[PDB]
Design a protein around this ligand. Structure first.
Ligand SMILES: [Mg+2]
Lengths: 170, 365
């Protein structure tokens, strides 16, 4: 019932926003990526991928559909941003030269971030733009799949925010 | 600020413009939490579902015939700038100058003959007229008819196709309608901004559909994000102008989600640059900046076109982009009559602009 709502909602939005990209995605794939952008879908899925809750059969299938769909989309080759707040001991591990890798999906956006004590600039090309699946195509979300590795190649504290620069290491 | 600088330098500099970025929805904000079960970040965002203020289309506060004159100005002005800018294409700045529609250039053209910039724009216009929406496959089919058969050419042949555009058409033919490519930064050329005007005319009543069609039309051949986002910004500039805004209003900073180099163009960083700080290269960012600069620094359509074309190097692309912006600002009725008279297929181009204008769908609600 839920997956069909996701598929039909995402399909309507994509046909408005970029109908040709829509054809790259199966019903299962487009509904799964859309579901990742809902609170119920994201809160069930990403904490399991990050090892906080168990990755159950239904969640395994969910992840596979998301990543199969992202794999069809064209590369976003550029810089995107994540505004966030990291625990002190995690930020301490983000030293220049360090490596980072999220077991979950990492949401970023092409837009300049507003909130968070940390602003992460992300350079890569495994991220995929998924804004065409939203109703207004307005948030420029670029989604990195699980276990993308990044090297911390720069860091600076400017005003109250720690800026980090991640380079994807394929 | 030099837009060629690395994005680390630019993004630190751009922090003075954080107010130009729309706030996260509450859902996207949740996805940016370190732990979404223990949220840390302001929870005041709007639903992801909901229409943001920066997509509220400003109403057309000029008479319909005046807006039509600006829409005609945008598409005809594109062609006029193309026909004049090609004269100095590939030459070093200030070796030679151009002051009139004289033809020549690398393709040894007759006066009024335009090049691939206008060909691609006419393909886009015709695809809208036929489909009633942006249909990337139909757009690509029209480009292939131009490329392979000289349809929508000023002189009957395809003669100036860029390598990235050619690659896209060859790949579409080889791989079919699902192909998307040219993502790499070396493909962030001008081909999509120089053909943008038909999208902004057809979508004149909806910023959201302008936003959604502008990156999509780029993607028919160019999927570099700086091309896609430059088309979105140019598309909004043209929307504001076609709907009657002043130049000062159109060129003021707009809230919209843009990658940092287009964000800085939005922020107005070109306004006080001198000509020797402006680049007319094949890079989309240089060209967009140069065209905004040319319109900002002149007071009529004639002067805007010549200031762009005399930049040399890729004079064609900056002049075609300037022609769209200046044409929407000043209107078709303020383009020099001798240039309209010499411009090849001028009546056809005007009529396509008019067709797009009247077919423009109502805003969604
Ligand atoms: Mg050309």
């Amino acid at each position: 019932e839920q997956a069909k709502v996701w598929t039909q909602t995402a399909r309507a939005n994509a046909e408005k926003n970029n109908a040709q990209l829509s054809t790259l995605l199966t019903d299962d794939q487009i509904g799964a990526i859309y579901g990742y952008t809902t609170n119920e879908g994201y809160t069930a899925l990403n904490p399991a991928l990050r090892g906080q809750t168990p990755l159950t059969p239904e969640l395994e299938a969910f992840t596979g559909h998301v990543t199969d769909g992202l794999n069809k989309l064209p590369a976003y080759n550029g810089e995107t941003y994540r505004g966030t707040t990291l625990p002190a001991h995690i930020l301490e591990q983000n030293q220049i030269g360090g490596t980072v890798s999220d077991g979950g999906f990492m949401s970023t956006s092409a837009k300049t971030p507003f909130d968070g004590d940390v602003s992460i600039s992300v350079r890569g090309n495994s991220g995929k733009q998924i804004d065409f699946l939203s109703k207004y195509k307005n948030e420029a979300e670029v989604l990195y799949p699980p276990n993308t590795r990044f090297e911390v190649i720069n860091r600076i504290e400017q005003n109250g925010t720690t800026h980090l620069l991640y380079r994807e290491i394929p | 600020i030099d837009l060629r600088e690395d994005t680390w330098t630019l993004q630190l500099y751009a922090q003075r413009y954080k107010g130009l970025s729309p706030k996260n929805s509450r859902e996207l904000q949740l996805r940016m939490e370190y732990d979404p079960l223990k949220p840390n970040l302001p929870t005041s965002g709007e639903e992801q579902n909901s229409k943001p203020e920066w997509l509220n289309t400003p109403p057309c506060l000029i008479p319909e015939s005046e807006s039509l004159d600006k829409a005609k100005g945008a598409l005809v002005g594109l062609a006029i700038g193309d026909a004049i800018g090609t004269t100095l294409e590939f030459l070093p700045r200030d070796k030679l100058h151009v002051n009139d529609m004289v033809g020549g250039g690398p393709f040894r053209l007759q006066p009024g003959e335009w090049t691939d910039d206008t060909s691609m724009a006419l393909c886009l216009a015709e695809s809208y007229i036929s489909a009633g929406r942006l249909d990337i496959t139909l757009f690509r089919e029209k480009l292939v008819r131009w490329y392979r058969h000289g349809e929508n050419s000023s002189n009957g042949r395809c003669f100036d196709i860029g390598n990235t555009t050619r690659n896209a058409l060859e790949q579409y033919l080889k791989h079919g309608a699902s192909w998307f490519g040219n993502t790499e930064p070396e493909t962030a050329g001008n081909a999509a901004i120089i053909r943008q005007a038909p999208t902004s005319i057809f979508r004149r009543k909806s910023l959201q559909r302008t936003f959604a069609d502008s990156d999509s039309q780029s993607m028919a051949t160019h999927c570099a994000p700086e091309s896609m986002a430059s088309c979105q910004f140019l598309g909004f500039i043209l929307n504001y102008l076609i709907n009657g805004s002043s130049r000062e209003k159109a060129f003021s900073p707009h809230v919209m989600p843009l990658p940092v180099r287009v964000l800085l163009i939005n922020a107005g960083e070109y306004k006080e640059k001198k000509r020797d700080e402006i680049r007319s290269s094949g890079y989309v960012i240089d060209t967009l900046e140069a065209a905004m600069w040319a319109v900002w620094n002149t007071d009529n359509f004639h002067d805007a076109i010549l200031l762009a074309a005399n930049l040399g190097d890729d004079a064609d692309s900056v002049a075609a982009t300037t022609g769209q912006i200046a044409g929407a600002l000043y209107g078709y009725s303020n383009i020099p009559k001798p240039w309209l008279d010499k411009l090849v297929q001028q009546e056809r181009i005007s009529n396509l602009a008019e067709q797009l204008f009247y077919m423009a769908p109502e805003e969604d609600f």
